[PDB]
Design a protein around this ligand. Structure first.
Ligand SMILES: COCc1cc(Br)ccn1
Length: 129
C-alpha cells in the first residue's frame, strides 16, 4: 500500500522456530474464530491504515502495531513457538487501541467487547499436552 504506512508485522520467517501446540490450535480454532466473527471485529481485521484514516501521528505513537489479520496469518502459517507469543499479540492489539484513543471512543468500546470475550476464552486455554 502507501509508503507512508509501515510494513506490517512479520508473518513469515524461515529462521524463526515454530511449533504446533494444542494451545496454539485452540487459539486458532476457538479464540481467533470467536473474535473474528464478532460484530465489532472489523476495525481490527487488518493493520491500521493511518493514511486512509488521516491519522498521521498513529505510527509515531504506536511503535508496536498489531492486528487480528496479522495474528490470523501467524496462526494459519504456524509462525509461533508457543501460546504466550500469540496471547501477547492480542494484548498488544488491545493496548494499542487504549493508548491511542480516548476512553469511551467507539473504537475503545469495540476493543473492550473483544477483550472481554478474549479473556473468557483464554481462561479456558487447555493444559499444554
Ligand atoms: C482514530 O482511532 C485510531 C485507531 C483506529 C483503528 Br482502525 C484502530 C485503533 N486506533
Amino acid at each position: 500500500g502507501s509508503h507512508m504506512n509501515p510494513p506490517p508485522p512479520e508473518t513469515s520467517n524461515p529462521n524463526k522456530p515454530k511449533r504446533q501446540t494444542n494451545q496454539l490450535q485452540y487459539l486458532l480454532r476457538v479464540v481467533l474464530k470467536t473474535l473474528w466473527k464478532h460484530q465489532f471485529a472489523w476495525p481490527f481485521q487488518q493493520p491500521v491504515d493511518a493514511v486512509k484514516l488521516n491519522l498521521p501521528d498513529y505510527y509515531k505513537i504506536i511503535k508496536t502495531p498489531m492486528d487480528m489479520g496479522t495474528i490470523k496469518k501467524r496462526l494459519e502459517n504456524n509462525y509461533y513457538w508457543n501460546a504466550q507469543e500469540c496471547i501477547q499479540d492480542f494484548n498488544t492489539m488491545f493496548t494499542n487501541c487504549y493508548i491511542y484513543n480516548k476512553p469511551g471512543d467507539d473504537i475503545v468500546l469495540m476493543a473492550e467487547a473483544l477483550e472481554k470475550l478474549f479473556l473468557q476464552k483464554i481462561n479456558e486455554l487447555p493444559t499444554e499436552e
